[PDB]
Design a protein around this nucleic acid. Structure first.
Length: 426
DNA sequence: ACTCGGTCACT
DNA sequence: AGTGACCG
């Protein structure tokens, strides 16, 4: 209607590096390039755990959270790159640093929110407006969108590239003919900018990535996953009804867990589109005020979560699991590993201070004991006055020590977790 | 023995 | 301050 908002106010993108750890190792070792490849941490137990898988390898059914020995069964010629091991634990410095490479390049084009080590949201609203004035009254060539997919098109050719182009042509012709909306043009320009951003990333780092372009973060992330790897997908406001009509609820971000399952069970539906039938009040009564309102808008393709201008992580942490018989049963053992964790943490913290002009003021300590269903048996915190590994390990020990029911440590600890938080300018 | 990272909501 | 859901 005249007064119903359509959530077409912004142009937002979600960029995801494809199989990012694998790409990092592949850039470093040319032998791994263009091959079924995976990144493994630890080697002793069942060949180690796969944490990242190349698309060649995925074709064989190889997945993350899979034992290397089992991956080798599915893909005999699988090549493996090992995560760096420092102080007896996995060290992800190489990947964090690679992430910084990419993020810095992205920031040149637009404002970014660092979602994760391999994921970032991008707010293109301002950039699109500027590009439009420069580009005013100028048709947009398909050549400007060499890797772009328009979801829902074509509508009305057997090769995938043929289909992509036909879909693109229909979209562009419509744009061109004045049949589409102002918001549609804005998304289109956003896509052009993302193509340029992704080209810059590849040229300057060698890394490829997939991206989604839409009017909000949720649609952008969903769009990103539609065409991978090394491709980008534009999801228009108009494409939502058809797209959501067969979209499982769990596919929407934040709906992949218990809430999503409750939605399906309580309402007796499967797909995101089915949510439109319910009143905002109905949804709120079942799932709470905040969730209900969010669901009511989201099923209609509307989401208002802002892309936060955050280039750096809010927290800096390290942890190690001690599963099965490796569980820590002695006091000296626990202290030694706390020291290992504290030492890596100190190095990363000092680096962070020099690079980013900030200091952490809080240290969080978490542990898990054997037989405990919960991920965390306890979570305690204390002041972080100095970037000193010995002091940090000592303090962490002090806060968790009464946890021991009773030289020996009982019950044995299956997890140790240190996190630096509450940063201040410096 | 589905790691080791992380952000955000509830109370 | 502490627990926990959610993401991959």
């Amino acid at each position: 209607g005249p007064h119903m908002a359509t959530g077409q106010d912004r142009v937002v993108a979600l960029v995801d590096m494809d199989c990012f750890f694998v790409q990092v190792e592949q850039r470093q070792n040319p032998h791994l390039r263009n091959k079924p490849c995976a990144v493994v941490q630890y080697k002793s137990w069942k060949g180690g755990g796969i944490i990242a898988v190349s698309y060649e390898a995925r074709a064989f059914g190889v997945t993350r959270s899979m034992w290397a020995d089992d991956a080798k069964k599915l893909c005999p010629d699988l090549l493996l790159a090992q995560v760096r091991e420092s102080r007896g634990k996995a060290n992800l410095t190489k990947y964090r640093e690679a992430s910084v490479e990419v993020m810095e390049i992205m920031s040149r084009f637009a404002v970014i929110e660092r979602a994760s080590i391999d994921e970032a949201y991008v707010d293109l609203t301002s950039a699109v407006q500027e590009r439009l004035q420069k580009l005013q009254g100028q048709p947009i060539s398909a050549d400007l969108l060499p890797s772009t997919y328009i979801e829902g098109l074509p509508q009305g050719t057997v090769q995938k590239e043929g289909m992509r182009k036909q879909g693109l042509f229909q979209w562009l012709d419509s744009l061109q003919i004045d049949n589409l909306t102002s918001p549609d043009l804005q998304l289109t320009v956003g896509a052009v900018i993302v193509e340029e951003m992704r080209a810059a990333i590849e040229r300057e780092t060698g890394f490829q990535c997939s991206a989604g372009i839409s009017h909000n973060k949720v649609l952008a992330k969903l769009a990103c996953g539609l065409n991978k790897p090394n491709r980008q997908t534009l999801v228009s406001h108009g494409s939502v009804p058809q797209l959501f009509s067969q979209m499982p609820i769990r596919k929407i971000r934040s709906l992949g867990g218990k809430l999503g399952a409750s939605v399906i069970e309580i309402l007796g539906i499967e797909y995101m589109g089915e949510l439109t039938q319910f009143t905002e009040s109905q949804l709120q009564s079942h799932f709470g005020e905040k969730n209900g309102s969010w669901l009511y808008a989201m099923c209609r393709g509307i989401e208002h979560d802002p892309v936060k201008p955050r280039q750096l992580p809010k927290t800096i942490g390290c942890s190690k699991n001690f599963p099965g018989k490796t569980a820590l049963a002695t006091r000296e053992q626990v202290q030694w590993w706390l020291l290992q964790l504290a030492q890596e943490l100190e190095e990363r913290l000092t680096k962070d201070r020099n690079d980013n002009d900030r200091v952490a003021t809080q240290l969080v300590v978490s542990i898990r004991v054997q037989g405990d269903k919960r991920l965390s048996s306890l979570r305690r915190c204390c002041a972080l006055t100095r970037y000193d590994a010995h002091k940090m390990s000592h303090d962490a020990f002090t806060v968790i020590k009464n946890c021991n029911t009773s030289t020996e440590w009982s019950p044995p600890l299956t997890m140790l977790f240190l996190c630096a938080t509450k940063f201040s300018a410096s």
